[PDB]
Enzyme design. Structure first.
Site, mmCIF file in Angstrom:
data_model
loop_
_atom_site.group_PDB
_atom_site.id
_atom_site.type_symbol
_atom_site.label_atom_id
_atom_site.label_comp_id
_atom_site.label_asym_id
_atom_site.label_seq_id
_atom_site.Cartn_x
_atom_site.Cartn_y
_atom_site.Cartn_z
ATOM 1 N N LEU D 198 0.734 -0.962 -0.219
ATOM 2 C CA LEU D 198 0.244 -0.012 -0.565
ATOM 3 C C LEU D 198 0.826 1.535 -0.389
ATOM 4 O O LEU D 198 0.454 2.706 -0.512
ATOM 5 C CB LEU D 198 -0.758 0.069 1.540
ATOM 6 N N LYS D 200 3.825 0.818 -2.362
ATOM 7 C CA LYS D 200 4.290 1.296 -3.419
ATOM 8 C C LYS D 200 4.119 2.033 -4.560
ATOM 9 O O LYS D 200 2.594 2.563 -4.482
ATOM 10 C CB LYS D 200 4.144 -0.112 -4.188
ATOM 11 N N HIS D 258 -0.377 -8.981 0.741
ATOM 12 C CA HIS D 258 -0.457 -8.134 -0.326
ATOM 13 C C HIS D 258 -1.144 -8.233 -1.500
ATOM 14 O O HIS D 258 -1.373 -7.241 -2.365
ATOM 15 C CB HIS D 258 1.334 -8.684 -1.254
ATOM 16 N N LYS D 352 8.300 -17.741 -5.859
ATOM 17 C CA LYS D 352 9.839 -17.641 -5.084
ATOM 18 C C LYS D 352 10.618 -18.627 -6.180
ATOM 19 O O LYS D 352 9.917 -20.330 -6.697
ATOM 20 C CB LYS D 352 9.906 -17.961 -4.110
HETATM 21 O O1 LIG Z 1 8.571 -6.018 -1.310
HETATM 22 P P1 LIG Z 1 8.666 -7.224 -2.754
HETATM 23 O O2 LIG Z 1 9.748 -7.335 -3.129
HETATM 24 O O3 LIG Z 1 7.553 -6.493 -3.541
HETATM 25 O O4 LIG Z 1 8.577 -8.489 -1.700
HETATM 26 C C1 LIG Z 1 7.192 -8.322 -0.982
HETATM 27 C C2 LIG Z 1 7.591 -9.222 0.260
HETATM 28 O O5 LIG Z 1 7.360 -8.145 1.653
HETATM 29 C C3 LIG Z 1 7.406 -9.142 2.654
HETATM 30 O O6 LIG Z 1 6.689 -8.349 3.377
HETATM 31 C C4 LIG Z 1 6.832 -10.452 2.474
HETATM 32 O O7 LIG Z 1 7.882 -11.368 3.810
HETATM 33 C C5 LIG Z 1 7.666 -11.617 1.982
HETATM 34 O O8 LIG Z 1 6.999 -12.241 1.138
HETATM 35 C C6 LIG Z 1 7.321 -10.796 0.015
HETATM 36 O O9 LIG Z 1 8.318 -10.634 -0.482
#
Ligand SMILES: O=P(O)(O)OC[C@H]1O[C@@H](O)[C@H](O)[C@@H](O)[C@@H]1O
Ligand SMILES: O=P(O)(O)OC[C@H]1O[C@@H](O)[C@H](O)[C@@H](O)[C@@H]1O
Ligand SMILES: [Cl-]
Ligand SMILES: [Cl-]
Ligand SMILES: [Cl-]
Ligand SMILES: [Cl-]
Ligand SMILES: [Cl-]
Ligand SMILES: [Cl-]
Ligand SMILES: [Cl-]
Ligand SMILES: [Cl-]
Ligand SMILES: [Cl-]
Ligand SMILES: [Cl-]
Ligand SMILES: [Cl-]
Ligand SMILES: [Cl-]
Ligand SMILES: [Cl-]
Ligand SMILES: [Cl-]
Ligand SMILES: [Cl-]
Ligand SMILES: [Cl-]
Ligand SMILES: [Cl-]
Ligand SMILES: [Cl-]
Ligand SMILES: [Cl-]
Ligand SMILES: [Cl-]
Ligand SMILES: [Cl-]
Ligand SMILES: [Cl-]
Ligand SMILES: [Cl-]
Lengths: 502, 494, 502, 494
Positions: D198, D200, D258, D352
């Protein structure tokens, strides 16, 4: 020939006691609409058999039973279907003289409620209270303060609900302060600010016809709708009570309350849930986007004596102040400022002493230019809430027979023709819904303000004498200027015919 | 009651002479539908006073006047208002015996025609000739070649028009050949390929209800419509005329022609103009986008004897070939491949010896999920072309009364209840429109092709024995498998 | 680094001979645009190596080879890749002196083509004839009658096609006469009425960007589009050729022909097929629904001298008649009368001696009122056909960074950045398409009429002196009244482009 | 270069003291993401000059100042512009060793905090307290009960806010319990449930791009959109810490939080206002209509060693339990049950040890059948949230040049090419928004529930061993079955 009373008493109401206090029991509204509606709900077996209707008025009532059987009962309607029950019903009504200012009298009201609440032989030892305040606006806050002090029900021993009748101030400032005056006195949840148009059969179907059907749902936006017209028409004038009306006027009396409600359900977005507040939230949300009525975008009238002379002039009333300019008629062009109603004109019409009695909603769709050209005309969905409850969609179809021509026609649904059900009076539904705790068909504070905020600037302009009030013959179609304004406002279709009308 | 016939015959037909030749006048269609429709057009005063209806068949006649007054006249309908006119009308009909291959008999039909328009006392010389070919498909090209040879009107002395009745081949290859066989013989303008459904009151309003109304125009696309159902139902079976039916089948007899016609009108884009050629262009354009019927997306039936035994089995007909597999019933799921009808299922139903007589179109709109959920159900616009010609939109409304509940209702328009008018038989409109020269309600050659191309692969699969033909009792709703398929195809019961 | 000639010559053009007659070969258009385009089509290997370009002009030139290598060749463009081919190409061009009225001179034209077709080393004995009529309108019908008489190809031996240039009459009556004058002379199929805008890269993509993409297809209607603006801007004036322009004017010169074309492809419905006539049918259909331009809904200008003295006034031209009121600038508001474009304003702009060189199309979408309000503004799809060929969709996005604010942005596609291809001149495509027989990018007679019928009443009003022609400085944004009219016409966005502009 | 830090810290944060307690300061998250984000907010002059960052952890430090400049500071990023400020900033961070359960240590934390706000030289009395709980889920409720008892700011003397990090239970039942465990301890208003997605840059523009633009607003429905694809791709595996991931899995770790978050923003209806709860209300409203993920409509993977051998197998980890079936990859087909998203497939992908690092949203529009046919293909709006921040709409255009052919093209906007601005890390925005009190970019309790309710049945099926977990080579595209499923799910690979 009387139909029996079945047990349609909702399970909540048939565990704890019930007391329906009608404050202002002598008054015209209570005689004519409240008490008669309570009889019909009793006959339907929707009220507990051991219910307690308590009349609390100022009148020094000599023979209560005579007033009950002669005055009160004279107003009950279905008697070829429920006439025998008048006796059993009237036995539940009790009267109590008292004032709307002396706390000793409200205590005397709490006293009588408990004396008849204690008499209950049911499962729960509590007792529920519904207070119908059909009293002048002159004593409203007094009674509210009086009831909130010493007439409330003990905690965990029942609910208290208040049916608050109109008027709700003359403008937004007047209403705002009254709404502040009740804030400490009661929680909004207990308040049931009544608008009766939310009890009319066709007015209730606005939400269903609009969000159950894909046919109307896909068309309810600026792309398909060219114009929306809400019409109030009354054959009768003020005639008797002109003195009362002078201080209110057609906008405050019908447009601000009844027709802005029609307008809220017509324009609102699909509710989150069918919950009371979920529905109410969308109602306020849309009135919050209505642009306030501008004086230049309206026509006002005041009726003069009829050609026959049977209907007198508005001013030709002794109660009507000399040289008054009170509008008895108004036509407005409102604008809803959102992506759904952008551009769509909203023509609201209302008048007394007109050509006919009428309540209808007209959703006029865009004109379909090609391939039919002049051989066709705007379709409109018409919902008539009174006289004959009906819903009809006006279309264009081929002239039936051995010919290649067009004709305008209807896809009609006439309630009186299709259903053998004797539809209830607006007040039966409302009172019943209030006993159940359904705040949906009741005006919310914010919803009420949202409504006042539309008309308050126009109302003020009118009261400052800035807006012209045109004269029109009683029983005619209304002022000429109005029909012209409606044309200019965006409304079309050649379906406006009387001898006068065109 | 009996009143004077008005002279309201169109001014085009007023100037020159008129001759309506009914080739195959003895035939079942002419005596049952053609002649009766001609009587009604005469009574309307839509035909000139001095019109000439000529019967021409292989049948030999002893007493033409007896066949006229007893056979022919027995089929006329409005007789409590128009019964007196039967005399005056019949006086215009004349009969002649002839072969549909002998050029002499054709030189004889023409000579009669010459002499008739030679007796005309109007403004223009010569005459107009309308030829109604209600004759077997077995002799069609013979008569077309014969009429085109020695039965035509000299140029600048009138028009010749040909009302061509069905069948139009057994498939796309058969029909193609036949259309090529007529190409030198007549100009398409002269040809009037008749499909009688285009003359039905409700079938005619399909274009108006769709393109005159913004209400239906805005809804006529994939976004609002969930399913479209075209239904043909007939209480009667093949009866005595079963041998003829065996070679045709329910798809070729009703679906390919009549119902693909309703389908074209229902799916077509708004015509450029309301012109004949502008309307028909859109009809062909949309059938050109219909995906051909696949065998796996269809159900076929053949009726068994009824529970009562009053209706005998289809196979229990001497005329019906032993061990036949001819479908008397069919339900199809068709797909229109364009951005308007993408995904929208088209369920076409047709069957003989069923539960009821019915012709209706069902435009089932998408289900409105929230906020009403199960308290609501798909809206449907229903156009019933027969029995009672009516149009009604099904809708969800609050249960009237002291209730917070829903109920399904409709917004009716029943033509019998709303209009005092005695609506014409499909054939009255068509014959009339053909006299005026309105090629709109007539099948075009490309239109005919476009239609055949939908069913020809399915029809062939059927004829190769690749598709199963299920049995169903006469008078029953039809095979069980069909109702299940309709559910799977996207239609919701209501 | 000389790019060799491939055999990418279409199979039709191979079998029979080829003769491209350029009528009026001395003329400005032929030497500047026709001949140069023919060189590029030869270089691309799209014309047979043994093609015959014949120049038929009135000029009595002595050294044809000098005019070929010095005049004609001086106009050829890619010479750092195709410079060597100038020789081989020029060897195909031949010149002929001759009248436009004496038939003996036309028979002498037939005669030379015959000798050329008799020298063809290919399979068929006939030959194909393409006639490019880049001659004055004063002699047009003369040449058409002369060519149709004694310059046509024998039956079953080759096609004859005619590339006809602008002007096509003064108005609809003038054009009607001219079209009737050609009806017996040639079949419409042979006629190739040239508008060179259908030859521009961005103008060609109008049909693809609209009917290949669901994104634009779903938005191309009255519900999503609030306004459409077609803009023609030219930094240069009439300079020397003010005389030639005085009789034509900005509406007849660009608004009637070029921009009504852009307008037809912008407004038309999805074609039945991608066929030539299927496309052309929808073009005619939509211009048939365009309401004719009304004089009250337009602004006219005539350029005055610039501040810097560099650009003299329009009238300050010796060729320009004394006291002429010829418009050098026009802005009009057009209305398409169909269910797709109902209400949508069409603002067409065109002017010479303005602030910048520009050809762009602006599809301005409806303003999204809530929830962003003033934090947002109408999205507009912009297609710029020149200077830099680009397509960009203007959008509202969050200010990038550690902020909760908005900013207007673009989703751009710049043809010179992305595609690293040397795009052809409008005339290369057209001449090529005419050799193939693709009547799509050529004006149809009804398509020409439908166009004239829009402007003829306005043009007449102008010529009767009924419409005011405002003065504006040469190199400015144009008259003040015009920008105000554009705002009133329905066009928005705060484009403070220049010192003058806002 | 090195320039002055401005005092642009919000006027609310100015009057009263500030204390940012980072509970779990030793932890991987704080040292890698929290502390570095804190430095950048300080450099921005968005934090008061006299702010107090207190690291509270169980770990013991001999030299806090060494851990501050060497460990902590080693993670700060912009140092070619902000390198000098490392000193002044670090001078605000202080540490304390304390258990996450013993009340003495909580009195000892409070002790520090009062004394820090006692040292404040500003207008208002007391001080504001932000607690960042970057601690294991194993001690969460222990710290919540401990902080709610002791180290709470007195009423009318400042605010207390809790940035709670994930995980939020392992199912809907687990999460429910945990949320009830916090109900008495803190008011929801104080709780700031962090889902850093949220924060990004591209995730934030989801609301603006769809409700500020008529272009996307008119297209955001079932009529225009054919398919929606949310993609998370990671080149790296679990590496050294896998046993920890074993108990979580790809669905619980990324999708549930996410990507369901992106999904809510993508599908929600236009908010009543741009208010925090007006926005959050529509988010929950739409997840309340998402049908729970069914096991048959999903593909699961578990990475195997790479061809190169550089990336070892998932199970080839000592921390990874013997014979585990934990999914490291998942592709799901979700369905939103409302009249906007009816029929529209929602393909959520996450894995992953894949071929590339990727976060993108793909809004694939319907295929425009005529007049271009195969010469065209589905348009797609692509929002790539990482690696390169970009938004591009894919469309079909004429091949530029002397041609009548088509080609796919994009109307790009590349944030790295268009803006010269060094965009903040998700955590800078969030921490800042939390100091301001903007509950919009924080998970609500009902939001959390609505999310858990989608995956809990699927998650359970998986854990019961009912769903197959396919093996795939580390660094490859993932299992073959997945790409096939995506095609079947409705995604037309453009
Ligand atoms: O910030 P990124 O690179 O988009 O990845 C999000 C990451 O957020 C983290 O909080 C998670 O534990 C990970 O599993 C995830 O990969
Ligand atoms: O719908 P209608 O008027 O009954 O027409 C359907 C008819 O169609 C014809 O094709 C068949 O020969 C008949 O058997 C059938 O009845
Ligand atoms: Cl507002
Ligand atoms: Cl009617
Ligand atoms: Cl009815
Ligand atoms: Cl005011
Ligand atoms: Cl079958
Ligand atoms: Cl289907
Ligand atoms: Cl019938
Ligand atoms: Cl009816
Ligand atoms: Cl019948
Ligand atoms: Cl086959
Ligand atoms: Cl017109
Ligand atoms: Cl250019
Ligand atoms: Cl930019
Ligand atoms: Cl740029
Ligand atoms: Cl670019
Ligand atoms: Cl004129
Ligand atoms: Cl919405
Ligand atoms: Cl639900
Ligand atoms: Cl990155
Ligand atoms: Cl990163
Ligand atoms: Cl870019
Ligand atoms: Cl890039
Ligand atoms: Cl489960």
């Amino acid at each position: 020939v009387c139909e029996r009373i079945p047990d349609a008493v909702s399970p909540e109401l048939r565990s704890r006691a019930l007391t329906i206090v009608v404050l202002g029991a002598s008054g015209d509204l209570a005689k004519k609409k409240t008490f008669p509606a309570l009889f019909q709900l009793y006959c339907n077996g929707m009220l507990p058999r051991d219910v307690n209707i308590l009349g609390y008025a100022r009148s020094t009532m000599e023979d209560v039973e005579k007033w009950k059987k002669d005055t009160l009962a004279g107003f009950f309607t279905r008697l070829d279907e429920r006439g025998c029950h008048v006796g059993n019903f009237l036995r539940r009504i009790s009267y109590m003289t008292g004032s709307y200012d002396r706390d000793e009298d409200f205590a005397r009201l709490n006293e009588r409620i408990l004396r008849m609440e204690e008499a209950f032989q049911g499962p729960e030892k509590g007792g529920n209270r519904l207070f119908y305040l059909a009293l002048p606006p002159s004593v409203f806050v007094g009674v509210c303060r009086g009831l909130s002090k010493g007439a409330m029900q003990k905690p965990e021993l029942g609910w208290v609900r208040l049916i608050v009748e109109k008027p709700f101030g003359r403008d937004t400032e007047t209403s705002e302060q009254l709404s502040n005056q009740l804030k400490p006195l009661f929680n909004e949840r207990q308040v049931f600010r009544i608008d009766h148009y939310l009890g009319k059969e066709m007015v209730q179907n606005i939400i269903v016809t609009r969000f159950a059907n894909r046919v109307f749902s896909a068309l309810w936006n600026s792309n398909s709708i060219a114009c929306v017209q809400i019409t109030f028409k009354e054959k009768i004038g003020t005639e008797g009570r002109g003195g009362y009306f002078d201080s209110i006027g057609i906008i405050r009396d019908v447009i601000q309350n009844h027709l802005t409600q029609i307008l809220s359900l017509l324009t609102m977005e699909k509710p989150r849930s069918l919950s009371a507040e979920d529905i109410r939230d969308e109602k306020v949300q849309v009135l919050r986007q209505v642009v306030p009525a501008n004086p230049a975008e309206c026509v006002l009238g005041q009726y003069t004596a009829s050609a026959d002379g049977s209907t007198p002039g508005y001013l030709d009333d002794p109660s009507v102040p000399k040289g008054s300019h009170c509008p008895t008629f108004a036509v407005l062009r409102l604008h809803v400022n959102n992506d759904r109603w952008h551009g769509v004109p909203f023509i609201i019409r209302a008048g007394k002493a007109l050509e006919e009695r009428l309540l209808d909603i007209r959703i006029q769709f865009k004109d379909e230019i090609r391939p039919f050209g002049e051989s066709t005309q705007r379709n409109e969905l018409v919902i008539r809430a009174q006289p004959s409850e009906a819903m009809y969609l006006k279309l264009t179809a081929k002239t039936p027979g051995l010919l290649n021509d067009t004709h305008q026609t209807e896809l009609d649904l006439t309630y009186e023709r299709r259903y053998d059900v004797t539809l209830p009076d607006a007040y039966e539904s409302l009172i019943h819904e209030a006993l159940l705790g359904n705040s949906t068909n009741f005006v919310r504070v914010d919803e009420l303000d949202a409504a006042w905020r539309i008309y308050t600037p126009l109302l003020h302009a009118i009261d400052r004498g800035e807006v012209k009030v045109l004269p029109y013959a009683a029983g005619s179609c209304g002022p000429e200027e109005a029909q012209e304004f409606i044309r200019i406002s965006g409304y079309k279709t050649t379906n406006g015919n009387a001898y006068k009308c065109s």
